[PDB]
């Protein structure tokens, strides 16, 4: 039998679907009661008529409710449940510092992530560089690590918005990926199943972005903001720059290292700090832990200054089966490439642009990520000492230090790197790291 | 892989397909190498954006070439391969006389007709009320029949427009049914695959029509005329009337009986005559057998009145393994319902309107139709001596005589009929049998 067809017919003639009906349809996407054709139809239908904000909210909550949602009340905490979501990026290690910095300021951050099949390097794989680290605690242990440390970074769940999976899969063959209320839907669902009080969204801007245009990035951000708030989750969003690598390194172990050193104070990429700081501020103000930006940045600076943030990162690692002294002796534990040598340019001048995606694939082809879904990850390879847009380039200053497993992989990695970076006789201009703050 | 999705995406955002693209997509349907979701999405994307005439012809020509297309060129037949297709309704028995009448005048009529699903009762169903009648002759048998008697009415093979199968199947679940070029593609394909030199289309109008409103019934006819003629087959289309039972009987055996008495001359329903004649006239003119309408009606009335048409029907039944003397001894071969008993109105007045859809549904409920193809048809059930739009009603004017399986099903039929026929003091406006003719 099919009541779904009525629902499709309704929305097809530009009517607005009800909460009850919206919840019906996705639940049947979950259970395979609703045919694939029907789903495609609905998708193409929503692709045409768009969706009202109430429809966007209902769709999002319904998807969020297709699986388990984490309840954090009853279990007693004096603070806000807050997380960060992001459309990802090369060098974007921010969540590794940001979780502990906020946890330190009174927030409880249950960061759930998705390795998926992502071409892009995922943070979950970054943490597996750390010997012993377990990305799959059970519900109970997860509740505790949040309860004591204030942050844990864990593995995905089928228990989280399962409807989205058949939904997305169908969307992907029917040219309906590509609709804002639908994207807003697949993006927000999983993240909202964490039972958040608050949220901040990082929408990338630039060449290396999920959204190819500033206005397009800004549009998504607004949409996401409007829908998230509408679901009783205090939310804002930031556009941030992805015209180059965000950190000074790209990979796994190597990126984990940058974060310990960011938290300890040993080294803070000024752009990565700008981003990281901006995001945490949002988590604090939305979370009702800071009155304004000045207060948040003060609270934030301090936990970086007294080592209390680095401590939280350290404890977290231990809570999750890692070595308890990781912060103090990270090099002791972090896998080290066999060959680690600077790559230099075929010419002089200033870096005027970089292709972050090419760079990102250079790393992948170095064992740094997964070409095939069955491949293993070599956690030691990556780049460090990434030159930056602006940097003057001679023959004495390297584009990067390529860490490889052997000279064969190192050399290809160097051709890829030289090829992905563009030099110019005259310098390009500064841009902010953080652009617009979006409240609604 | 498929590139199917790039064709979906292309029509979404409103672009022409181009045939190479369309022919490729139709075959994937037939071969099953294209997902149900991709059929749905493309149907939906067409409902929104519609198709051009070159897209319309391509669509139909493609579905038409997905199976076998019949050729009679070999047979060296003297006259035109003609046929008629109707969107049907309660009482529409026209083909039973039309085929022998047109055959009687020089045309060859290969009516391959399709199954009764779509709800309601079919032409093939009616014919099988005849003991011995076989609707599935093999390719040669069909040919030598058409060659010798000039007309055969046979059921559909696996190989006639098989692409429409899954196509319409998924359309009917996704609410992508009401699309004229989709309908025009579906309907014409099967019929154009018969090898027709010419064709007339009977598009019903009213409460018993496929289309809801007159203007849509016109729109479809126009499309069909345009495409059929586009596709290489002379074609005209008559908007005919269906606000009441066209014949005087509804059912299977009873409708066959009426066919016989129509040809011989025992009786002819005036309105059944108008439609049957006008459709046959088109076939004669479209089919190069009459220069003008008057000659056409003259050649048809002739064979209706020299017992020729009746004899052609006699030979066609016999050819298909009906009893050879059916025209003369039909009462002996057709099955008698167990209960035949009249139904009257519960109020005096004039018949102001009747729900034809409901009436047809009443007959199916009696056991004269198939809800689910598994069902057995009781061939002797139905209505006869049907009252008409306009008639005056009093205690001795029955709405109809009902042929029911038993007392239980008769009351049920009686109640449906009462509930479907509405009376009034005021005699409403008297509409024609044929509203418009379309060659343009
Ligand atoms: O595109 C379509 C849709 C329906 N039909 C069939 O034709 C009948 C009406 O002519 C319908 O009930 C259905 O059975 C077609 O031939 N083509
Ligand atoms: O409107 C109608 C319907 C049927 N009949 C006749 O009723 C008889 C039924 O046995 C046949 O002579 C048939 O022609 C009529 O006279 N008028």
PDB file of C-alpha atoms in Angstrom, chain B residues 118-350:
ATOM      1  CA  UNK B 118      -6.734   0.760 -14.829  1.00  0.00           C
ATOM      2  CA  UNK B 119     -10.002  -0.312 -13.267  1.00  0.00           C
ATOM      3  CA  UNK B 120     -13.242  -1.028 -15.136  1.00  0.00           C
ATOM      4  CA  UNK B 121     -14.005  -3.578 -17.873  1.00  0.00           C
ATOM      5  CA  UNK B 122     -12.134  -4.082 -21.165  1.00  0.00           C
ATOM      6  CA  UNK B 123     -12.840  -4.896 -24.812  1.00  0.00           C
ATOM      7  CA  UNK B 124     -10.939  -8.192 -24.523  1.00  0.00           C
ATOM      8  CA  UNK B 125     -12.897  -9.169 -21.444  1.00  0.00           C
ATOM      9  CA  UNK B 126     -16.172  -8.709 -23.310  1.00  0.00           C
ATOM     10  CA  UNK B 127     -15.024 -10.880 -26.218  1.00  0.00           C
ATOM     11  CA  UNK B 128     -14.022 -13.718 -23.882  1.00  0.00           C
ATOM     12  CA  UNK B 129     -17.626 -14.043 -22.748  1.00  0.00           C
ATOM     13  CA  UNK B 130     -17.958 -15.863 -26.068  1.00  0.00           C
ATOM     14  CA  UNK B 131     -17.336 -19.581 -25.421  1.00  0.00           C
ATOM     15  CA  UNK B 132     -14.232 -20.612 -27.322  1.00  0.00           C
ATOM     16  CA  UNK B 133     -12.986 -17.125 -28.139  1.00  0.00           C
ATOM     17  CA  UNK B 134      -9.175 -16.960 -28.096  1.00  0.00           C
ATOM     18  CA  UNK B 135      -7.504 -13.549 -27.819  1.00  0.00           C
ATOM     19  CA  UNK B 136      -3.925 -14.904 -28.279  1.00  0.00           C
ATOM     20  CA  UNK B 137      -3.252 -16.165 -31.825  1.00  0.00           C
ATOM     21  CA  UNK B 138       0.422 -16.480 -32.836  1.00  0.00           C
ATOM     22  CA  UNK B 139       2.104 -13.993 -35.181  1.00  0.00           C
ATOM     23  CA  UNK B 140       1.104 -15.912 -38.320  1.00  0.00           C
ATOM     24  CA  UNK B 141      -2.410 -16.807 -37.196  1.00  0.00           C
ATOM     25  CA  UNK B 142      -3.031 -13.136 -36.442  1.00  0.00           C
ATOM     26  CA  UNK B 143      -1.713 -12.297 -39.891  1.00  0.00           C
ATOM     27  CA  UNK B 144      -3.728 -14.766 -41.963  1.00  0.00           C
ATOM     28  CA  UNK B 145      -6.830 -13.789 -39.979  1.00  0.00           C
ATOM     29  CA  UNK B 146      -6.331 -10.089 -40.729  1.00  0.00           C
ATOM     30  CA  UNK B 147      -5.530 -11.132 -44.285  1.00  0.00           C
ATOM     31  CA  UNK B 148      -8.727 -13.173 -44.724  1.00  0.00           C
ATOM     32  CA  UNK B 149     -11.354 -11.532 -42.512  1.00  0.00           C
ATOM     33  CA  UNK B 150      -9.766  -8.067 -42.312  1.00  0.00           C
ATOM     34  CA  UNK B 151     -10.114  -7.629 -38.554  1.00  0.00           C
ATOM     35  CA  UNK B 152      -9.096  -9.361 -35.368  1.00  0.00           C
ATOM     36  CA  UNK B 153      -9.259  -8.263 -31.751  1.00  0.00           C
ATOM     37  CA  UNK B 154      -6.454  -9.849 -29.746  1.00  0.00           C
ATOM     38  CA  UNK B 155      -4.780  -9.452 -26.374  1.00  0.00           C
ATOM     39  CA  UNK B 156      -1.373  -7.865 -25.902  1.00  0.00           C
ATOM     40  CA  UNK B 157       1.980  -9.613 -26.150  1.00  0.00           C
ATOM     41  CA  UNK B 158       5.060  -9.263 -23.949  1.00  0.00           C
ATOM     42  CA  UNK B 159       6.804  -7.534 -26.821  1.00  0.00           C
ATOM     43  CA  UNK B 160       4.575  -4.485 -27.417  1.00  0.00           C
ATOM     44  CA  UNK B 161       6.075  -1.282 -25.978  1.00  0.00           C
ATOM     45  CA  UNK B 162       7.495  -3.156 -22.916  1.00  0.00           C
ATOM     46  CA  UNK B 163       9.271   0.031 -21.768  1.00  0.00           C
ATOM     47  CA  UNK B 164       5.936   1.554 -20.755  1.00  0.00           C
ATOM     48  CA  UNK B 165       5.409  -1.291 -18.313  1.00  0.00           C
ATOM     49  CA  UNK B 166       7.755  -0.229 -15.492  1.00  0.00           C
ATOM     50  CA  UNK B 167       7.462   3.362 -16.701  1.00  0.00           C
ATOM     51  CA  UNK B 168       3.715   3.590 -16.085  1.00  0.00           C
ATOM     52  CA  UNK B 169       4.121   1.293 -13.072  1.00  0.00           C
ATOM     53  CA  UNK B 170       6.291   3.753 -11.248  1.00  0.00           C
ATOM     54  CA  UNK B 171       4.369   6.747 -12.582  1.00  0.00           C
ATOM     55  CA  UNK B 172       1.301   5.359 -10.801  1.00  0.00           C
ATOM     56  CA  UNK B 173       2.972   5.394  -7.393  1.00  0.00           C
ATOM     57  CA  UNK B 174       4.845   8.665  -7.682  1.00  0.00           C
ATOM     58  CA  UNK B 175       1.952  10.932  -8.800  1.00  0.00           C
ATOM     59  CA  UNK B 176       3.549  11.600 -12.180  1.00  0.00           C
ATOM     60  CA  UNK B 177       0.535  10.232 -14.013  1.00  0.00           C
ATOM     61  CA  UNK B 178      -1.195  13.485 -15.026  1.00  0.00           C
ATOM     62  CA  UNK B 179       1.362  14.541 -17.585  1.00  0.00           C
ATOM     63  CA  UNK B 180       0.066  14.916 -21.076  1.00  0.00           C
ATOM     64  CA  UNK B 181       3.276  14.153 -22.916  1.00  0.00           C
ATOM     65  CA  UNK B 182       3.808  11.212 -20.540  1.00  0.00           C
ATOM     66  CA  UNK B 183       0.267  10.013 -21.196  1.00  0.00           C
ATOM     67  CA  UNK B 184       0.638  10.729 -24.890  1.00  0.00           C
ATOM     68  CA  UNK B 185       3.873   8.739 -24.833  1.00  0.00           C
ATOM     69  CA  UNK B 186       2.367   5.791 -22.979  1.00  0.00           C
ATOM     70  CA  UNK B 187      -0.947   5.546 -24.925  1.00  0.00           C
ATOM     71  CA  UNK B 188       0.276   6.016 -28.487  1.00  0.00           C
ATOM     72  CA  UNK B 189       3.332   3.746 -28.277  1.00  0.00           C
ATOM     73  CA  UNK B 190       1.414   0.465 -27.979  1.00  0.00           C
ATOM     74  CA  UNK B 191      -0.988   1.498 -30.697  1.00  0.00           C
ATOM     75  CA  UNK B 192       1.653   2.915 -33.056  1.00  0.00           C
ATOM     76  CA  UNK B 193       3.544  -0.374 -32.771  1.00  0.00           C
ATOM     77  CA  UNK B 194       0.751  -2.102 -34.691  1.00  0.00           C
ATOM     78  CA  UNK B 195       1.973  -0.790 -38.048  1.00  0.00           C
ATOM     79  CA  UNK B 196      -0.873   1.642 -38.623  1.00  0.00           C
ATOM     80  CA  UNK B 197      -1.241   3.691 -41.797  1.00  0.00           C
ATOM     81  CA  UNK B 198      -3.944   5.598 -39.927  1.00  0.00           C
ATOM     82  CA  UNK B 199      -5.602   5.873 -36.544  1.00  0.00           C
ATOM     83  CA  UNK B 200      -8.486   7.624 -34.859  1.00  0.00           C
ATOM     84  CA  UNK B 201      -8.437   8.439 -31.167  1.00  0.00           C
ATOM     85  CA  UNK B 202     -11.604   8.495 -29.066  1.00  0.00           C
ATOM     86  CA  UNK B 203     -11.041  10.772 -26.051  1.00  0.00           C
ATOM     87  CA  UNK B 204     -13.902  10.568 -23.561  1.00  0.00           C
ATOM     88  CA  UNK B 205     -15.404  13.645 -21.869  1.00  0.00           C
ATOM     89  CA  UNK B 206     -17.271  14.001 -18.577  1.00  0.00           C
ATOM     90  CA  UNK B 207     -17.954  12.173 -15.317  1.00  0.00           C
ATOM     91  CA  UNK B 208     -16.917   8.900 -16.937  1.00  0.00           C
ATOM     92  CA  UNK B 209     -13.832  10.306 -18.625  1.00  0.00           C
ATOM     93  CA  UNK B 210     -10.111   9.756 -17.988  1.00  0.00           C
ATOM     94  CA  UNK B 211      -9.442  13.490 -17.918  1.00  0.00           C
ATOM     95  CA  UNK B 212     -11.380  15.505 -15.299  1.00  0.00           C
ATOM     96  CA  UNK B 213     -12.236  18.588 -17.337  1.00  0.00           C
ATOM     97  CA  UNK B 214     -13.187  19.143 -20.938  1.00  0.00           C
ATOM     98  CA  UNK B 215     -10.166  21.340 -21.567  1.00  0.00           C
ATOM     99  CA  UNK B 216      -7.752  18.646 -20.485  1.00  0.00           C
ATOM    100  CA  UNK B 217      -9.525  16.091 -22.684  1.00  0.00           C
ATOM    101  CA  UNK B 218      -8.993  18.513 -25.565  1.00  0.00           C
ATOM    102  CA  UNK B 219      -5.373  19.083 -24.614  1.00  0.00           C
ATOM    103  CA  UNK B 220      -4.624  15.362 -24.697  1.00  0.00           C
ATOM    104  CA  UNK B 221      -6.343  14.837 -28.060  1.00  0.00           C
ATOM    105  CA  UNK B 222      -4.350  17.719 -29.506  1.00  0.00           C
ATOM    106  CA  UNK B 223      -1.090  16.273 -28.185  1.00  0.00           C
ATOM    107  CA  UNK B 224      -1.966  12.789 -29.410  1.00  0.00           C
ATOM    108  CA  UNK B 225      -2.946  14.060 -32.853  1.00  0.00           C
ATOM    109  CA  UNK B 226       0.261  16.070 -32.994  1.00  0.00           C
ATOM    110  CA  UNK B 227       2.528  13.234 -31.993  1.00  0.00           C
ATOM    111  CA  UNK B 228       0.822  10.399 -33.858  1.00  0.00           C
ATOM    112  CA  UNK B 229       0.909  12.483 -36.996  1.00  0.00           C
ATOM    113  CA  UNK B 230       4.399  13.509 -35.989  1.00  0.00           C
ATOM    114  CA  UNK B 231       5.309   9.832 -35.627  1.00  0.00           C
ATOM    115  CA  UNK B 232       4.292   8.993 -39.210  1.00  0.00           C
ATOM    116  CA  UNK B 233       0.697   7.862 -38.747  1.00  0.00           C
ATOM    117  CA  UNK B 234      -2.279   9.780 -40.118  1.00  0.00           C
ATOM    118  CA  UNK B 235      -4.374  10.530 -37.138  1.00  0.00           C
ATOM    119  CA  UNK B 236      -7.510  12.267 -36.009  1.00  0.00           C
ATOM    120  CA  UNK B 237      -9.200  12.426 -32.634  1.00  0.00           C
ATOM    121  CA  UNK B 238     -12.813  12.839 -31.607  1.00  0.00           C
ATOM    122  CA  UNK B 239     -13.828  14.185 -28.246  1.00  0.00           C
ATOM    123  CA  UNK B 240     -16.834  11.927 -27.558  1.00  0.00           C
ATOM    124  CA  UNK B 241     -19.272  12.019 -24.720  1.00  0.00           C
ATOM    125  CA  UNK B 242     -19.319  10.056 -21.509  1.00  0.00           C
ATOM    126  CA  UNK B 243     -21.706  11.468 -18.986  1.00  0.00           C
ATOM    127  CA  UNK B 244     -23.804   8.357 -19.250  1.00  0.00           C
ATOM    128  CA  UNK B 245     -23.556   4.737 -20.418  1.00  0.00           C
ATOM    129  CA  UNK B 246     -22.771   4.856 -24.157  1.00  0.00           C
ATOM    130  CA  UNK B 247     -24.419   1.563 -24.993  1.00  0.00           C
ATOM    131  CA  UNK B 248     -27.644   0.462 -23.331  1.00  0.00           C
ATOM    132  CA  UNK B 249     -25.819  -2.326 -21.556  1.00  0.00           C
ATOM    133  CA  UNK B 250     -22.787  -2.474 -19.241  1.00  0.00           C
ATOM    134  CA  UNK B 251     -20.907  -5.721 -18.781  1.00  0.00           C
ATOM    135  CA  UNK B 252     -19.504  -8.494 -20.905  1.00  0.00           C
ATOM    136  CA  UNK B 253     -21.878 -11.024 -22.379  1.00  0.00           C
ATOM    137  CA  UNK B 254     -24.620  -8.383 -22.460  1.00  0.00           C
ATOM    138  CA  UNK B 255     -22.366  -5.952 -24.302  1.00  0.00           C
ATOM    139  CA  UNK B 256     -21.499  -8.639 -26.807  1.00  0.00           C
ATOM    140  CA  UNK B 257     -25.206  -9.274 -27.347  1.00  0.00           C
ATOM    141  CA  UNK B 258     -25.715  -5.579 -27.962  1.00  0.00           C
ATOM    142  CA  UNK B 259     -22.875  -5.624 -30.501  1.00  0.00           C
ATOM    143  CA  UNK B 260     -24.602  -8.361 -32.444  1.00  0.00           C
ATOM    144  CA  UNK B 261     -28.034  -6.768 -32.436  1.00  0.00           C
ATOM    145  CA  UNK B 262     -26.306  -3.523 -33.508  1.00  0.00           C
ATOM    146  CA  UNK B 263     -24.750  -5.068 -36.611  1.00  0.00           C
ATOM    147  CA  UNK B 264     -27.705  -7.238 -37.700  1.00  0.00           C
ATOM    148  CA  UNK B 265     -30.136  -4.429 -37.008  1.00  0.00           C
ATOM    149  CA  UNK B 266     -32.328  -5.807 -34.283  1.00  0.00           C
ATOM    150  CA  UNK B 267     -31.439  -2.746 -32.359  1.00  0.00           C
ATOM    151  CA  UNK B 268     -29.127   0.207 -32.429  1.00  0.00           C
ATOM    152  CA  UNK B 269     -28.608   2.622 -29.591  1.00  0.00           C
ATOM    153  CA  UNK B 270     -28.890   6.079 -31.161  1.00  0.00           C
ATOM    154  CA  UNK B 271     -25.951   7.478 -29.160  1.00  0.00           C
ATOM    155  CA  UNK B 272     -23.905   4.288 -29.558  1.00  0.00           C
ATOM    156  CA  UNK B 273     -24.507   4.762 -33.293  1.00  0.00           C
ATOM    157  CA  UNK B 274     -23.259   8.350 -33.438  1.00  0.00           C
ATOM    158  CA  UNK B 275     -19.909   7.605 -31.840  1.00  0.00           C
ATOM    159  CA  UNK B 276     -19.389   4.292 -33.634  1.00  0.00           C
ATOM    160  CA  UNK B 277     -20.114   5.883 -36.981  1.00  0.00           C
ATOM    161  CA  UNK B 278     -17.974   9.009 -36.506  1.00  0.00           C
ATOM    162  CA  UNK B 279     -14.990   6.932 -35.361  1.00  0.00           C
ATOM    163  CA  UNK B 280     -15.440   4.621 -38.351  1.00  0.00           C
ATOM    164  CA  UNK B 281     -15.650   7.673 -40.618  1.00  0.00           C
ATOM    165  CA  UNK B 282     -12.277   8.947 -39.486  1.00  0.00           C
ATOM    166  CA  UNK B 283     -10.763   5.535 -40.175  1.00  0.00           C
ATOM    167  CA  UNK B 284     -12.262   5.624 -43.671  1.00  0.00           C
ATOM    168  CA  UNK B 285     -11.016   9.127 -44.445  1.00  0.00           C
ATOM    169  CA  UNK B 286      -7.689   8.906 -42.574  1.00  0.00           C
ATOM    170  CA  UNK B 287      -7.404   5.561 -44.314  1.00  0.00           C
ATOM    171  CA  UNK B 288      -7.895   6.630 -47.889  1.00  0.00           C
ATOM    172  CA  UNK B 289     -11.209   4.774 -48.351  1.00  0.00           C
ATOM    173  CA  UNK B 290     -13.539   7.741 -48.395  1.00  0.00           C
ATOM    174  CA  UNK B 291     -12.820  11.183 -49.769  1.00  0.00           C
ATOM    175  CA  UNK B 292     -15.373  12.773 -47.546  1.00  0.00           C
ATOM    176  CA  UNK B 293     -17.510  12.287 -44.560  1.00  0.00           C
ATOM    177  CA  UNK B 294     -20.668  11.662 -46.464  1.00  0.00           C
ATOM    178  CA  UNK B 295     -19.257   8.983 -48.613  1.00  0.00           C
ATOM    179  CA  UNK B 296     -17.794   7.463 -45.516  1.00  0.00           C
ATOM    180  CA  UNK B 297     -21.110   7.388 -43.646  1.00  0.00           C
ATOM    181  CA  UNK B 298     -22.648   6.085 -46.871  1.00  0.00           C
ATOM    182  CA  UNK B 299     -20.245   3.154 -47.183  1.00  0.00           C
ATOM    183  CA  UNK B 300     -20.691   2.319 -43.477  1.00  0.00           C
ATOM    184  CA  UNK B 301     -24.467   2.560 -43.352  1.00  0.00           C
ATOM    185  CA  UNK B 302     -24.460   0.339 -46.422  1.00  0.00           C
ATOM    186  CA  UNK B 303     -22.563  -2.524 -44.760  1.00  0.00           C
ATOM    187  CA  UNK B 304     -24.577  -1.990 -41.603  1.00  0.00           C
ATOM    188  CA  UNK B 305     -27.732  -2.500 -43.652  1.00  0.00           C
ATOM    189  CA  UNK B 306     -26.777  -5.171 -46.176  1.00  0.00           C
ATOM    190  CA  UNK B 307     -25.800  -7.555 -43.345  1.00  0.00           C
ATOM    191  CA  UNK B 308     -22.151  -7.303 -44.409  1.00  0.00           C
ATOM    192  CA  UNK B 309     -20.628  -5.886 -41.227  1.00  0.00           C
ATOM    193  CA  UNK B 310     -22.606  -8.427 -39.227  1.00  0.00           C
ATOM    194  CA  UNK B 311     -21.159 -11.245 -41.342  1.00  0.00           C
ATOM    195  CA  UNK B 312     -17.638  -9.915 -40.943  1.00  0.00           C
ATOM    196  CA  UNK B 313     -18.133 -10.049 -37.178  1.00  0.00           C
ATOM    197  CA  UNK B 314     -19.417 -13.586 -37.673  1.00  0.00           C
ATOM    198  CA  UNK B 315     -16.259 -14.654 -39.473  1.00  0.00           C
ATOM    199  CA  UNK B 316     -13.967 -12.927 -36.979  1.00  0.00           C
ATOM    200  CA  UNK B 317     -15.516 -14.725 -34.002  1.00  0.00           C
ATOM    201  CA  UNK B 318     -15.218 -17.988 -35.905  1.00  0.00           C
ATOM    202  CA  UNK B 319     -11.608 -17.212 -36.819  1.00  0.00           C
ATOM    203  CA  UNK B 320     -10.716 -16.855 -33.181  1.00  0.00           C
ATOM    204  CA  UNK B 321     -12.348 -20.124 -32.282  1.00  0.00           C
ATOM    205  CA  UNK B 322     -15.695 -18.755 -31.466  1.00  0.00           C
ATOM    206  CA  UNK B 323     -18.706 -20.786 -32.547  1.00  0.00           C
ATOM    207  CA  UNK B 324     -19.289 -20.282 -36.267  1.00  0.00           C
ATOM    208  CA  UNK B 325     -22.954 -19.395 -35.872  1.00  0.00           C
ATOM    209  CA  UNK B 326     -22.623 -16.862 -33.071  1.00  0.00           C
ATOM    210  CA  UNK B 327     -24.318 -14.000 -34.836  1.00  0.00           C
ATOM    211  CA  UNK B 328     -27.401 -16.172 -35.379  1.00  0.00           C
ATOM    212  CA  UNK B 329     -27.445 -18.112 -32.090  1.00  0.00           C
ATOM    213  CA  UNK B 330     -25.827 -15.802 -29.572  1.00  0.00           C
ATOM    214  CA  UNK B 331     -28.512 -16.391 -26.920  1.00  0.00           C
ATOM    215  CA  UNK B 332     -27.359 -20.012 -27.006  1.00  0.00           C
ATOM    216  CA  UNK B 333     -23.667 -19.248 -26.445  1.00  0.00           C
ATOM    217  CA  UNK B 334     -23.657 -16.248 -24.137  1.00  0.00           C
ATOM    218  CA  UNK B 335     -24.118 -17.096 -20.452  1.00  0.00           C
ATOM    219  CA  UNK B 336     -27.258 -16.085 -18.618  1.00  0.00           C
ATOM    220  CA  UNK B 337     -26.923 -14.325 -15.290  1.00  0.00           C
ATOM    221  CA  UNK B 338     -28.773 -16.189 -12.549  1.00  0.00           C
ATOM    222  CA  UNK B 339     -30.793 -13.140 -11.512  1.00  0.00           C
ATOM    223  CA  UNK B 340     -32.193 -10.576 -13.920  1.00  0.00           C
ATOM    224  CA  UNK B 341     -34.392  -8.023 -12.228  1.00  0.00           C
ATOM    225  CA  UNK B 342     -35.172  -4.332 -12.675  1.00  0.00           C
ATOM    226  CA  UNK B 343     -34.287  -1.384 -10.460  1.00  0.00           C
ATOM    227  CA  UNK B 344     -36.396   1.756 -10.213  1.00  0.00           C
ATOM    228  CA  UNK B 345     -35.914   5.197  -8.698  1.00  0.00           C
ATOM    229  CA  UNK B 346     -37.187   6.148  -5.271  1.00  0.00           C
ATOM    230  CA  UNK B 347     -38.599   9.445  -6.657  1.00  0.00           C
ATOM    231  CA  UNK B 348     -40.285  10.789  -9.793  1.00  0.00           C
ATOM    232  CA  UNK B 349     -38.413  13.232 -12.010  1.00  0.00           C
ATOM    233  CA  UNK B 350     -36.141  13.400 -15.051  1.00  0.00           C
TER     234      UNK B 350
END
